[PDB]
Amino acid sequence: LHHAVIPHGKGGRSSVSGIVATVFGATGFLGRYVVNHLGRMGSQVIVPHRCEPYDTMHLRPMGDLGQIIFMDWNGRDKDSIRRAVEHSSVVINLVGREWETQNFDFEDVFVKIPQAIAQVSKEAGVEKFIHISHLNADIKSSSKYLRSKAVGEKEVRETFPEATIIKPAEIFGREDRFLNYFANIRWFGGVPLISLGKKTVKQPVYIVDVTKGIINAIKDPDARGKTFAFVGPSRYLLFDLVQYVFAVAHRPFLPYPLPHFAYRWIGRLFEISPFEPWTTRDKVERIHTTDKILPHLPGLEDLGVEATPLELKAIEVLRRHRTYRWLSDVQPAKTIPTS
Amino acid sequence: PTVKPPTARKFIWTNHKFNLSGTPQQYVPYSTTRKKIQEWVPPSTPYK
Amino acid sequence: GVRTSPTGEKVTHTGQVYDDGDYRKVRFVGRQKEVNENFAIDLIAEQPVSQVGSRVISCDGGGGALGHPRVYINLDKETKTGTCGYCGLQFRQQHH
Amino acid sequence: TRPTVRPRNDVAHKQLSAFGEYVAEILPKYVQQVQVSCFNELEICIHPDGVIPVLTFLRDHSNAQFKSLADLTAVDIPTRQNRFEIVYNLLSLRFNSRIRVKTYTDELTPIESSVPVYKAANWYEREIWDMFGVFFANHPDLRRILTDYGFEGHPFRKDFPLSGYVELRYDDEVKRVVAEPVELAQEFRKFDLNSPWEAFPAYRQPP
Amino acid sequence: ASTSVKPIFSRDMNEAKRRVRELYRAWYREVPNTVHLFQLDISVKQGRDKVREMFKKNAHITDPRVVDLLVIKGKMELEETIKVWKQRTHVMRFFHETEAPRPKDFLSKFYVGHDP
Amino acid sequence: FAYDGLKRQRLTEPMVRNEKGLLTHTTWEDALSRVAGMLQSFQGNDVAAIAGGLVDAEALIALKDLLNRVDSDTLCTEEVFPTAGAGTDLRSNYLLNTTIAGVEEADVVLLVGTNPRFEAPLFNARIRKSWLHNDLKVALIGSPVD
Amino acid sequence: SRGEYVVAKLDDLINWARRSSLWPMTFGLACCAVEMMHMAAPRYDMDRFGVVFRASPRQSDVMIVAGTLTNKMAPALRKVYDQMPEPRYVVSMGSCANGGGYYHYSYSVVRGCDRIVPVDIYVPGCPPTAEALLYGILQLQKKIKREKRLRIWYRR
Amino acid sequence: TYKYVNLREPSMDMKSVTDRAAQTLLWTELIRGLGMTLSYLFREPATINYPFEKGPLSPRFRGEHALRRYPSGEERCIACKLCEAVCPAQAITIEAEPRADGSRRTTRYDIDMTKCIYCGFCQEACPVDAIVEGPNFEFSTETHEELLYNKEKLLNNGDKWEAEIAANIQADYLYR
Numbered sequence A: 001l002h003h004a005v006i007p008h009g010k011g012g013r014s015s016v017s018g019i020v021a022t023v024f025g026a027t028g029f030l031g032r033y034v035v036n037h038l039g040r041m042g043s044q045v046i047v048p049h050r051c052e053p054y055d056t057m058h059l060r061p062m063g064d065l066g067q068i069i070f071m072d073w074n075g076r077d078k079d080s081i082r083r084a085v086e087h088s089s090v091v092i093n094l095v096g097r098e099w100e101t102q103n104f105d106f107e108d109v110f111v112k113i114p115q116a117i118a119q120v121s122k123e124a125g126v127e128k129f130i131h132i133s134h135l136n137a138d139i140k141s142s143s144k145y146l147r148s149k150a151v152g153e154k155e156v157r158e159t160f161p162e163a164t165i166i167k168p169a170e171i172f173g174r175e176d177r178f179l180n181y182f183a184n185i186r187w188f189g190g191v192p193l194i195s196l197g198k199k200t201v202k203q204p205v206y207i208v209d210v211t212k213g214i215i216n217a218i219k220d221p222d223a224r225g226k227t228f229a230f231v232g233p234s235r236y237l238l239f240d241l242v243q244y245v246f247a248v249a250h251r252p253f254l255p256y257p258l259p260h261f262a263y264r265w266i267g268r269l270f271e272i273s274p275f276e277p278w279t280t281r282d283k284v285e286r287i288h289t290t291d292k293i294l295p296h297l298p299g300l301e302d303l304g305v306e307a308t309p310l311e312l313k314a315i316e317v318l319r320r321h322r323t324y325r326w327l328s329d330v331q332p333a334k335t336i337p338t339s
Numbered sequence B: 001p002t003v004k005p006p007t008a009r010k011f012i013w014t015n016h017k018f019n020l021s022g023t024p025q026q027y028v029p030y031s032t033t034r035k036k037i038q039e040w041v042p043p044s045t046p047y048k
Numbered sequence C: 001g002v003r004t005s006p007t008g009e010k011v012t013h014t015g016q017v018y019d020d021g022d023y024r025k026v027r028f029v030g031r032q033k034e035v036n037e038n039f040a041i042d043l044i045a046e047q048p049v050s051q052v053g054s055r056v057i058s059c060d061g062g063g064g065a066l067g068h069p070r071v072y073i074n075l076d077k078e079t080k081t082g083t084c085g086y087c088g089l090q091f092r093q094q095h096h
Numbered sequence D: 001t002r003p004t005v006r007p008r009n010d011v012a013h014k015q016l017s018a019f020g021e022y023v024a025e026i027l028p029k030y031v032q033q034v035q036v037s038c039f040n041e042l043e044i045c046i047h048p049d050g051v052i053p054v055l056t057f058l059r060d061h062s063n064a065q066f067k068s069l070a071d072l073t074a075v076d077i078p079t080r081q082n083r084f085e086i087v088y089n090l091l092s093l094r095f096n097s098r099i100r101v102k103t104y105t106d107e108l109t110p111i112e113s114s115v116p117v118y119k120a121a122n123w124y125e126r127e128i129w130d131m132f133g134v135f136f137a138n139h140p141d142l143r144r145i146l147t148d149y150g151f152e153g154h155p156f157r158k159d160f161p162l163s164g165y166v167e168l169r170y171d172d173e174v175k176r177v178v179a180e181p182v183e184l185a186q187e188f189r190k191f192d193l194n195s196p197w198e199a200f201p202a203y204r205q206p207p
Numbered sequence E: 001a002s003t004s005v006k007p008i009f010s011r012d013m014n015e016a017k018r019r020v021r022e023l024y025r026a027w028y029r030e031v032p033n034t035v036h037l038f039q040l041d042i043s044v045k046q047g048r049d050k051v052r053e054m055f056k057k058n059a060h061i062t063d064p065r066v067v068d069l070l071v072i073k074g075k076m077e078l079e080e081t082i083k084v085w086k087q088r089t090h091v092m093r094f095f096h097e098t099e100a101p102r103p104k105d106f107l108s109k110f111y112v113g114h115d116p
Numbered sequence F: 001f002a003y004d005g006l007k008r009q010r011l012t013e014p015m016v017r018n019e020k021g022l023l024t025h026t027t028w029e030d031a032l033s034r035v036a037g038m039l040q041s042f043q044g045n046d047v048a049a050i051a052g053g054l055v056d057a058e059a060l061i062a063l064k065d066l067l068n069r070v071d072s073d074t075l076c077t078e079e080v081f082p083t084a085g086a087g088t089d090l091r092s093n094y095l096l097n098t099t100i101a102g103v104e105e106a107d108v109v110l111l112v113g114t115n116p117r118f119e120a121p122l123f124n125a126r127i128r129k130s131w132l133h134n135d136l137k138v139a140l141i142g143s144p145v146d
Numbered sequence G: 001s002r003g004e005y006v007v008a009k010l011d012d013l014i015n016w017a018r019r020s021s022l023w024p025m026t027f028g029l030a031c032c033a034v035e036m037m038h039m040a041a042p043r044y045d046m047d048r049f050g051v052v053f054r055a056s057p058r059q060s061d062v063m064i065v066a067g068t069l070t071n072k073m074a075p076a077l078r079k080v081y082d083q084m085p086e087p088r089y090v091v092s093m094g095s096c097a098n099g100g101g102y103y104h105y106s107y108s109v110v111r112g113c114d115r116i117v118p119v120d121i122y123v124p125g126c127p128p129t130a131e132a133l134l135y136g137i138l139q140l141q142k143k144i145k146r147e148k149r150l151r152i153w154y155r156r
Numbered sequence H: 001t002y003k004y005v006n007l008r009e010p011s012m013d014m015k016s017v018t019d020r021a022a023q024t025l026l027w028t029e030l031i032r033g034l035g036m037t038l039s040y041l042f043r044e045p046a047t048i049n050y051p052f053e054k055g056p057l058s059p060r061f062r063g064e065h066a067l068r069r070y071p072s073g074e075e076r077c078i079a080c081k082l083c084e085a086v087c088p089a090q091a092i093t094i095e096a097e098p099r100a101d102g103s104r105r106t107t108r109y110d111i112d113m114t115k116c117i118y119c120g121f122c123q124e125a126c127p128v129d130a131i132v133e134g135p136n137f138e139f140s141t142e143t144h145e146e147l148l149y150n151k152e153k154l155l156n157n158g159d160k161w162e163a164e165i166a167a168n169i170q171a172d173y174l175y176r
């Protein structure tokens, strides 16, 4: 056969793991960690990128010589997609954008592009296909981000029936826009929370846990044609989680409620920025959307991954936001008991 | 070279190429040797 | 000489070429495969056999000290040509 | 005289032999063997207890005045019970001569520090501990000098692998340089160069 | 005659064990300072667990000279940490946070490769 | 000069039969699990084993122990040796008791149905050394080979 | 106009500014630093290309890793790289920094500074001549001249 | 024979004491140091106009590697592996086998230009002048992989620099 590369070595940087992975959207938050884990074990990683080559430099030290290969690709060009997957054995799709641009909207990035990748991958004979969706993907959702997530999730499952679909909650980490989002609001005095952040329940997950789930899903034959839900171990109220972030960051906490219609108005204001908007209408909808419970979907325990509590890994994320070095502790946040 | 031109030979490049690093014509390393151990190919017919 | 396998990839003078389903071909996407188009096995075959009139001849590759160590080539056999072990030049005896 | 052979200095060979006996008589309690090589170098082999006495005698005596410690190092010979061999190279400026003093130790036996005699031995003994693991007793400040902090092992020992056991790398997940077991994209090729024919019959060993 | 060997610091295991406990106390008192000074993300409990694991690795030794060297090396290791000669990377090399768990059982080692 | 056969026709992956009756590559988990299932179902005489001409002692004992734990004793070899009588109970019954180096001490050698020049080339060479130096008398019962 | 024209010219302006004012922070680690000092010497006078002799890390644009990078020094080289404001480039000078060089198989040597930091240009030699290093710097200017930061932003 | 560098007794007559007082107060010897830098401002600088001007080199210069041929086009290398044995950095990797015509030729010839210390021992060891270090020193790359040369790259360098490599060998082989 022309596959089964027969891994060699001891699992290190100069070893061979037999994984030839095309990671789409590898230059972002989640992709930064996926390439690192693939290159740590000695995988051949193809990285199609749309940005400047200068913005992929942080990926080069993640693999041995010749193990990370960079290509140009365009979301709407099938030929470029073909060139980057015709030799791979697994295709990972991490394309996404928390806002809409003048050229790409949520329909483009969460439906058309994932469907194009899935269709081309099927034609090229790619055995495995990992696609990332959201835990709160729903067609009856106020957020157009989460509506397009549901539409695209369904369209991948038909184009590529054997694809593995991962549905994570809000992922927290050093480069995340979830805990870092509830720390830069200090620039605007108090912390506006719809309903004072009492009607929303969040179950955030750790970036490394989500990364080890994807990697274990590649080597696990039972993940083909299976849908997962990566969630953290604890559930929190948006108020008691945002309070914890400020407590860890040692910043003053001045919450105050704001009606839903007014919170969207200010979100409408920040959307004028021709650069990365600080917040948007869709962002406000997702920050306050309660995280769905899907007991009928396998979690991180079925992939051999133990979820990391937000308490352990909050300090590393929020250290940079503190203003003193060697200040001198904070109490764990209140958690909603199960059942 | 005008006064003392170099010796001509058939294998010398007639066209000189400048440094090609960073371009599609860049050099890419690879192993120049063939596969060392051949693997058995099963029969293409049943047995029972 | 230079020939291309049934996938568009040139074959080196050592006979190296990636199979149709080898992932290692991805290194040449957007780039090129370096192959020397001056196969030496073919070029040395273009050299005419030298007709010499003695049983034993010496070859130093031409250039004296700029060549290769001086070897002596026996020419008794009349069924083949005495070839130089270093440079490949062939020699024959004058019909006896 | 042969243009290609190093000329022999027999006058200096006789002087160094005479002084070797001189030292062998004045310090019988420690001197174990004295010898002079064909290129006129004098070696005094001593019991390790005689480091401070012998070195102080050579530094202070009026017919020695070996007031400079040119070098202090160790050799690892695993086939000996006392694998390590401590070598002191001393220079006399009064008599324009050099003497070598050799002792021995093993992994667990310490050797008295010679910092009191020659203050130059401070760093030279930190390097012997760092690279060979010999411990020097009463050293004012003994600790690794050349190797990385927390480095495990003694690189210059004969059984320590050339490439070590760990290699460093930057990992973007933990945002720091990490240490991992060594893997080489190309292994160090080992060459067996020794010829199977004897070269120097003068140094042949009895069977 | 044969077993007569010059000691380093201790003349018997009782004297050696005294130095081991003194070193253990010095390390135990130091972990909170190391965690705060180096801004490590581990907890004091994790750090003190690591110290205990290191000491328990060498609990089968019955040679006073071998124990003295272990204590001598341990004292040097403590000095590099207290005086901040080490950096945050050197302290975090006792935890191996980036090495994937190597298999321990026969079947797991049988699949990956040939190493026993 | 036979080592180059260690580079051709090698088995490099586990293989099992598919739905069409052909052999396809698989993992060590799938192949061993498919073998353990059948081994557990059968027992006693239903499990047998044959050892080839290059098998090592470690593999021979391990296979025998595995087949013993299903109460099987049909551990066979390809090379016949008569079991009638003492059989393979006394080592002296199936060994070269004189040893290879003992031919140099022999003064008469009787070869029965064997061409040692090809079966044991380095044992035949030892016979010639005695034939050449010790004036050894050699007799053969069998086909007249050189 | 077309919009793409304004962005194309603005890229040239900022590309020209960045390659004409390359301020390097030199990590003189071993012999290769000497050949780096001969590029600052009168014959080649790197200062005449806009490349200042030396700059502090907080105002440096490119890091020249000139010499063997040992394990002991590796943490300190990453710390200086992390504190360089962006855009930041790294030039690996000499065999030791390129891939380990003469000391590739040593227990105390980082087999290439690209294990610790990204590298934009590799200058080969042991040491590279002062002119071969100046060719690398000039080859880094052309790399910066090909950047399309704004053209890519305009098409996001 | 020795000499003293700083063994002098300054004169203590009023003439000399007033000279040193004038130097201390009127900064005479500091202004003398300004005259030495003023002179340089009015000299021609030693800078050359690189890349339009290049620094002088000799025929012995050791630069980028190249594999050479005989005038007929046959490769000079006969896979003797002397360069691989002498290479102090172990930067040469060679594999060989009889060629289709029976000649002794290489199938792999790689120089890791990042292990190489550009020492020239390979061209000293070579008995047929196959492996040489050419005069090119301007082959810096944008990636670490472009500096792992294989036989095709080295034969391309030879066919690219033969006109200049042959001339340099002609000007130095009598010293070898």
Ligand SMILES: CCCCCCCCCCCCCCCCCC(=O)OC[C@H](COP(=O)([O-])OCC[N+](C)(C)C)OC(=O)CCCCCCCCCCCCCCCCC
Pocket (backbone or CB within 6 Å): H024, H025, H026, H027, H030, H031
């Ligand atoms: C009858 C009329 C009476 C009127 C009054 C008559 C006044 C007589 C003259 C007065 C004495 C002269 C005083 C001169 C100033 C004293 C300086 C001094 O203190 O020296 C001692 C000091 C110290 O000298 P020292 O290091 O040797 O120490 C002296 C004291 N001991 C030894 C005890 C420690 O020297 C310096 O000032 C160092 C000078 C460093 C400057 C380097 C740059 C010099 C470059 C030349 C610049 C030229 C400037 C021109 C500017 C023009 C602008 C328009």
Ligand SMILES: NC(=O)C1=CN([C@@H]2O[C@H](COP(=O)(O)OP(=O)(O)OC[C@H]3O[C@@H](n4cnc5c(N)ncnc54)[C@H](OP(=O)(O)O)[C@@H]3O)[C@@H](O)[C@H]2O)C=CC1
Pocket (backbone or CB within 6 Å): A024, A025, A026, A027, A028, A029, A030, A031, A049, A050, A051, A074, A075, A093, A094, A095, A096, A097, A098, A104, A109, A132, A133, A134, A135, A167, A168, A169, A170, A171, A172, A176, A177, A178
């Ligand atoms: N981060 C979180 O909290 C959650 C993540 N997810 C999903 O995981 C995936 C990764 O998201 P994340 O990394 O965290 O966020 P990022 O925005 O940081 O990653 C976005 C990546 O996708 C690329 N991208 C966006 N649009 C395009 C486009 N038109 N064409 C090509 N590439 C494009 C980007 O390339 P470039 O930067 O070069 O423009 C970038 O590499 C997304 O699909 C996200 O919806 C789901 C649940 C929670």
Ligand code: SF4
Pocket (backbone or CB within 6 Å): G030, G031, G032, G066, G067, G068, G093, G094, G095, G096, G097, G101, G102, G125, G126, G127, G128, H117
């Ligand atoms: S590459 Fe050569 S010159 Fe540069 S540091 Fe290493 S040995 Fe020295």
Ligand code: SF4
Pocket (backbone or CB within 6 Å): H083, H086, H087, H088, H089, H090, H091, H092, H111, H115, H116, H117, H118, H119, H120, H121, H122, H123
């Ligand atoms: S120049 Fe020296 S180090 Fe480089 S390949 Fe030749 S022998 Fe090896």
Ligand code: SF4
Pocket (backbone or CB within 6 Å): H076, H077, H078, H079, H080, H081, H082, H083, H084, H094, H122, H125, H126, H127, H128, H129, H130, H131
């Ligand atoms: S390049 Fe020269 S020394 Fe090296 S293998 Fe070829 S002929 Fe021998």
Ligand SMILES: [Zn+2]
Pocket (backbone or CB within 6 Å): C059, C060, C061, C068, C084, C085, C086, C087, C088, C089
């Ligand atoms: Zn010849």
